[PDB]
Amino acid sequence: DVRVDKAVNFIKPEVSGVAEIQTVTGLSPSTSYLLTPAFLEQNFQSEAGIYILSATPVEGEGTISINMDPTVTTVSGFIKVKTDTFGTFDLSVVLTTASKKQTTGFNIIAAT
Amino acid sequence: VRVDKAVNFIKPEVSGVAEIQTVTGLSPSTSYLLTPAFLEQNFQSEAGIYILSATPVEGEGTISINMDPTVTTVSGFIKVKTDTFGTFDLSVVLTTASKKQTTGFNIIAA
């Protein structure tokens, strides 16, 4: 079986094009998870520029892309990542234009 | 835990009238999770808003995709189990059927 363990929002990086580390905690130690993108009720045109997020695991596989360009829109990808012995993992998250302060996120999917 | 397959949603014919999508080629009698995805779509190639909802015929959850620029949502997940023939059915509805963009879902298993 498979299930959604919990939903987490992506961080909002401070600087355009410069990745920040997002740490996720509270999961089972030494366990494989799959992350998929999602967002709810966002106005991506509240100010100028385009919301474009990319996220990868520091150690793992996959890239999540959320590109809200109005004639070429993408929500795709996944991340495969394993927790450490403390139930945590790190992602690298980059916003192409950091003034886009909309909220997006991912589901954390687990075997059961 | 991985994506086994990605499949496109059907494009229903009539606004607000659900149609059945059958997914095949999966493991028999196995639980899957579905989450939405799409690539390089122009949701403004014509007038009206792309708004899709999908639910399993047997299972739970709803995927919602509302590309309204004022209130954009790409969300929800479906839990569904295949029959003994590796298939399952979804019920898919477009609010405005003239929006013929392509969207879809991941099929996830462990």
Return the amino acid letter for A31: T
Return the amino acid letter for B89: D
* Cβ contact B96:B50 at 8 Å: yes
- Domain residue ranges in chain A: 1-112
Distance of CA A85 to the CA centre of its chain: 22
| Beta pairing partners, B87 | none
Q: Report the C-alpha gap between A80 and A27 in whole angstroms.
A: 14
Q: What CA–CA distances, in Å, run from A102 to A44, A85, A109, B67, B94?
A: 6, 32, 23, 15, 26
Q: Report the C-alpha gap between A93 and A100 in whole angstroms.
A: 14
- Neighboring chain B residues of A36 at a CB cutoff of 8 Å: 35, 37, 77, 106, 108
Q: What CA–CA distances, in Å, run from A99 to A31, A39, B97, B101?
A: 35, 18, 35, 29
Mutate which of A30, A32, A75, A102 to test chain B, going by most B C-beta atoms within 10 A?
A75
Residue A77's H or E segment, with its range, is strand A73-77
**Residue (of B81, B77, B88) closest to B21 by Cα position:** B88
Written as one string, the DSSP assignment of A8-73 is EEPP--SSTT--EEEEE-SS-TT-EEEEEEEEEEE-TTSSSS--EEEEEESSEE--EEEE--TTSE
Q: Report the C-alpha gap between A49 and A46 in whole angstroms.
A: 9
* Cβ contact A103:A38 at 8 Å: no
SS3 A25: coil
Q: What is residue B51's DSSP assignment?
A: E
Please, what sign has the CA dihedral across residues A48, A22, A9, B30? positive
Question: How many interface pairs between A and B have CB atoms less than 8 angstroms apart?
Answer: 95
* Cβ contact A37:A104 at 8 Å: yes
* Cβ contact A79:A61 at 8 Å: yes
Q: Mark out the alpha helices in A10-58 (DSSP H runs).
A: none
Give the distance from residue B35's alpha carbon to the nearest chain A alpha carbon, in angstroms.
Answer: 7
Q: Do A40 and B73 touch (CB under 8 A)?
A: yes
* Cβ contact A88:A24 at 8 Å: yes
Residue count (chain B): 110
Q: Report the C-alpha gap between B98 and A17 in whole angstroms.
A: 37
Tokens of A102: 């909309």
Q: Do B1 and A107 touch (CB under 8 A)?
A: no
Q: What CA–CA distances, in Å, run from A108 to A35, A47, B8?
A: 5, 30, 22
- Which residue is closest to B105 within chain A, CA to CA? A76
- Neighboring chain B residues of A111 at a CB cutoff of 8 Å: 1, 110
Instruction: Count how many Cα atoms sit within 13 Å of the Cα of residue B71 in the half-sphere of its side chain.
Output: 2
